[PDB]
A and B are shown apart, each in its own frame.
With several copies, the nearest count.
Chain A
Amino acid sequence: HKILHRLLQD
C-alpha cells in the first residue's frame, strides 16, 4: 500500500 492510506486512517 501507500503512505496516503495511513495518513487517511490515522
Chain B
Amino acid sequence: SLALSLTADQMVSALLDAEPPILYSEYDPTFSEASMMGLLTNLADRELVHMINWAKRVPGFVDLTLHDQVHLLECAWLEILMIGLVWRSMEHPGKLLFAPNLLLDRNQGKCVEGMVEIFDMLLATSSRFRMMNLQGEEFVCLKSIILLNSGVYTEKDHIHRVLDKITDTLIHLMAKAGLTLQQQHQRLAQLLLILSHIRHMSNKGMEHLYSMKCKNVVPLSDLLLEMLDAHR
C-alpha cells in the first residue's frame, strides 16, 4: 500500500490535486420550496460523480475491496458534501455558497420545512472554520478523514493505519506553520471535534431527505436514491 509510504508533503500534494471541481447550479435566477430543493438535489447528484472519482484518488482508498469502498461512500457522502459547503462558504459570513451562482442565507432556508435548523448549523460550522482560520491543506485532510472514518465501524487495520498517517500529516502542517507543541494537539483536537458536528448535520440531513422522498416534494435521482436507501 503506497499510501503508507507517502511523506506528509507527498500526502498533502496528492490530496490537493485530487480536489473535485466547484460545480455551478442551473441558471435563470428567481425561491419556492420546490425550486430550491430541486436545484440542491440536482447540484448534489452531479457532485457525487466527482466525489466518487475523488475518493479513488484518496491514498489507501483503492486498497479496499469494492464492497468496502461502496460502504464508506454510502455513509460519508452527505458529510463530504457538507464539509465542502461550509469550506467554500467560509469567507461569506451569514451565507452558504452551494455554488458560485447559488449563495443562500438563513432567510432562504425558511421556505422549506425544517431546513432552517440545518442551515444554522452549517453557517455555525463555517463560522467556526473562519474563526480557526482553517487552511486548505487541513480541509482536504479532514474531508479524507471523514471518508475513511465514518463507515469503518459498520482489512480494518489498513484504514486505521491510513487514518494515523493523515494525523501525522495534520501535525506536520501545523508544526510547519510554527505552532507550538501544545498548540498542535489543541488545534488537532478542535478540528476533529468538528467532525462530530458534521456527522450530526449529515444525520439530520438524511432525515429531511428521507422525508421529502416520502412526500415527492422534489424527485430524487436514481443514484441519490441508492445513497439514501443505504441509510434506511
CB neighbours of A4 from chain B (8 A): 52, 70, 73-74, 223, 226-227
Interface contact A9-B66, CB-CB below 8 Å: yes
Q: A4 to B52: give the CA distance in the assembly, Å.
A: 8
> Across the two chains, which residue of chain A brings its CB closest to B227?
A4
The interface on chain B, measured as residues whose beta carbon lies within 8 A of the other chain's beta carbons, has a size of 13
CB neighbours of A5 from chain B (8 A): 66, 70
Flag whether B56 is at the interface (Cβ < 8 A): yes
Interface contact B66-A7, CB-CB below 8 Å: no
The interface on chain A, measured as residues whose beta carbon lies within 8 A of the other chain's beta carbons, has a size of 7
Flag whether B69 is at the interface (Cβ < 8 A): yes
> Across the two chains, which residue of chain A brings its CB closest to B70?
A4
CB neighbours of B223 from chain A (8 A): 3-4, 7
CB neighbours of A2 from chain B (8 A): 70, 226
8 Å CB contact of B226 from A3, A8, A9: A3
Q: A9 to B70: give the CA distance in the assembly, Å.
A: 11
Flag whether B222 is at the interface (Cβ < 8 A): yes
Given the interface pairs A8-B52, A8-B56, the reply to whether A3 lies near B69 with Cβ below 8 Å is no
Q: How far is the CB of B61 from chain A (nearest CB, A)?
A: 10
Q: A9 to B53: give the CA distance in the assembly, Å.
A: 9
Residue numbers of A with Cβ under 8 A of B are 2-5, 7-9
User: Contacts A4-B70, A4-B74 given; 11 further ones with Cβ under 8 A?
Assistant: A2-B226, A3-B223, A4-B52, A4-B73, A4-B227, A5-B66, A5-B70, A7-B52, A7-B53, A7-B223, A8-B56
Residue numbers of B with Cβ under 8 A of A are 49, 52-53, 56, 66, 69-70, 73-74, 222-223, 226-227
